[PDB]
Design a protein around this ligand. Sequence first.
Ligand code: HEM
Ligand code: HEM
Lengths: 450, 446
Amino acid sequence: KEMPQPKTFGELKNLPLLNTDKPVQALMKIADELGEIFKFEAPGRVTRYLSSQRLIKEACDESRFDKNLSQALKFVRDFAGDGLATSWTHEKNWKKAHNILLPSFSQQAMKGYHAMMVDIAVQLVQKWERLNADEHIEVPEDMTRLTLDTIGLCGFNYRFNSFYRDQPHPFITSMVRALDEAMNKLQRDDPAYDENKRQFQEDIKVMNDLVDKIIADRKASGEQSDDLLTHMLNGKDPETGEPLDDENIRYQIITFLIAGHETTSGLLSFALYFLVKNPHVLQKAAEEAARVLVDPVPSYKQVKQLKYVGMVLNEALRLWPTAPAFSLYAKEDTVLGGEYPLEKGDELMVLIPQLHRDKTIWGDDVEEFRPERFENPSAIPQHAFKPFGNGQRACIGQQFALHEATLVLGMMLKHFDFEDHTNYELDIKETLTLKPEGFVVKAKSKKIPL
Amino acid sequence: KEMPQPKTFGELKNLPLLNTDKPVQALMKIADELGEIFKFEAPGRVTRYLSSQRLIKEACDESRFDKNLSQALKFVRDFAGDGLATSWTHEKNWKKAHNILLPSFSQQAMKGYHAMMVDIAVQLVQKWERLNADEHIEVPEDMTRLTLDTIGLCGFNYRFNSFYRDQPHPFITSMVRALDEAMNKLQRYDENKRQFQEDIKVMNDLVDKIIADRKASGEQSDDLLTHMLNGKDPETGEPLDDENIRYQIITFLIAGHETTSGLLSFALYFLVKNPHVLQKAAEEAARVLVDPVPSYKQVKQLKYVGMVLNEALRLWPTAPAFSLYAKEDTVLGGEYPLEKGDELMVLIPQLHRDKTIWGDDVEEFRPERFENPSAIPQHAFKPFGNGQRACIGQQFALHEATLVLGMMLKHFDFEDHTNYELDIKETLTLKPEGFVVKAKSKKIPL
Ligand code: HEM
Ligand code: HEM
């Protein structure tokens, strides 16, 4: 009945606990100490962090709980607008954009994006083929180059050309700096932050200007590509009969870049980390890649046949889900788990890394990397594995992310042997997402042509 | 390109090769002679037996192959109906029952079945504790008593009371005789037909009566029957009807009892033939089972016992084959073209003897092979089938077998007093016929 709570700081209550550069990992340690639920209080804010499948499966009851905009999402909304990820379910533009965009993100829709994904994947492979002896790979950096260029190409047929640059495209610099300012605001307004504010508005203008120009350029030409922008310029919501307006389309494009690039590149980086730390898994995954990817360019159907590669990605998502939490609110008065009464509007946070370590679901070996857990998807209980959120507010880009990640990891395993030449010590950097900072490897080419 | 084929008998093609009392072992000997794939022809039937991990890993591609009802499963369907094991993947009742029954067969669901499993396991231990000096144990007979009573209790709260009987419960007599008739038809009668129909009515009547009794009672138990009476398929929103529920309960008894008792019998056989392995498993049992009654969590900690069971399943998988058909035209192993509908048989005991996977010591019993599942190549170990048509009772069988074997190793030392010579009887399943041991109690109370 009584709910545990971490240590407090006088008037600031629990808020200073978030004044750390690894807040998700700090919250995981608190969940280890306090259990399946703990209260987190701040000035004018109260929330509850859930860690057990028992309680999270109730929180995922859409008849009782809806998606809440966390403080992080509220700050991101200042440039993501009423895009899909930062809009309330009851806002007209959520259901409208959801209905219009759901078919463009289906598994069948990945057939149309496949060629553009291969374009960037081949650039990644060619970069590593052209490395000199004893040179190494900066894994999260190159994975971020890939995912960002892939969403740029599939999103609105724009080439950031990250593999031609040391310093990223100005749009990316502003987006990254905008996300940093939004996240820094959480653990933070005195007059000294006036420089942060002016820079924040400058970065927002950079993002809007480029995206608005591309939309305007596309409308003035009438050209039709295989990208999401063409789909949004021609799509109509069956319910309202309306299309997305130019402003919301911009917010959707910004959202795809934010919500998609860093989560997906982290997944690829974590997957390669776990593969080089578990050579038996790497051998098993590389064997499948060699057997399935028999052509110089992988086909869509071949990517679907990379079952074990997909198992590797799911197990990487189990241990380190790169979008590590989502927020919910109680639609009405209700009782959670038969002992925690909640009032209408009360907030809940789902700590996904803790859910994925619930020993009552996964057994005692929760910390071991074993893709064989996902050998048969039916053995996974309901709401035990939630790397892509829940219900109608689940990740719309799930099939996009998993197809890109399966394609790229498969090509990496086909074309190179990998060496953990530094015996890299896992150090997880936290931004809006999670990534293994400083993860480096050496790649020895198998000399297989593209 | 050209596919090997065993010796033929004129118009009957390969069919007389199955007119033997050990057909699986005969097929293993053919695979030893002909290799990883051979064609098997009969009047109006063509199938292909696969034995190598190289080809079977392709056959397990669910985008290219689906479960086929072998001739044996088709005959079992005459009393198992459209239960999970004898239904086609495209039948509405398969996916419906699959969605409904999957949560009640999960690892988490074993926590709720554990107490009933302990109930029967304690009866087995007490039977052996009460044997007189120089009396011996008939191993497959007692293991079948245990597994059959365990599924009766966990399945629908029914006590066959096999440890109170010499002659089995009348339902079991009809079930065994029905399975015998189905298998004899493969290698094959008005008396057989009338008897076959008599046994089907016996099985249906008892199961249907228990269902009606449960519905007429309204009581809620921790058994599979309760889950099926209240469960709804999330997809269609529909529950299983009473007739299909009958086929499911009949299926659990058929598909579960003899496969699991065979696993226990083969496991004990291999342990008494390998005293160093037996000592290792017995040491683990004593260290883990520190309470008079094993807990669910303690069974999960019997790691080496579980490896013993997996290695027993490697050498003698008690469900020794399954059948597949090609969903479309496809090429197997880059040299064997197959047309849509072409049938494949997976010879599991031969797959598990692939030296390219397990090394040269394939015939040696070494549970250490299973220390790391990640070191085992894909689709090399398939004692429970494949994919969405894999054994739904896998966690049930392994939990029961780990619990019972663990208690056996804790409470008794075992003697191979006859120096038993392995003789594998073939029914729907495999078992070591005539396997007997002596048990000397360690005098540890329950
Ligand atoms: C491994 C990669 C990814 C992970 C782990 C991930 C995770 C998530 C999670 C947990 C949510 C729900 C957040 C909440 O409830 O507040 C979400 C929502 C969303 N994601 Fe992803 N995501 C990934 C990749 C992508 C990609 C590639 C795209 C776009 C191309 C994308 C676009 C979105 C959108 C638009 C939403 C909001 C959906 C809605 O509310 O209608 N994500 N994602
Ligand atoms: C060591 C013991 C067992 C072994 C070796 C075993 C083996 C198998 C195999 C190989 C299959 C696939 C057959 C095919 O593909 O045609 C299968 C399916 C099945 N088994 Fe088991 N089994 C065992 C125990 C059990 C138990 C205890 C139960 C029930 C409590 C059970 C119920 C089933 C069912 C319902 C199916 C069909 C699943 C479906 O297609 O939806 N089995 N089993």
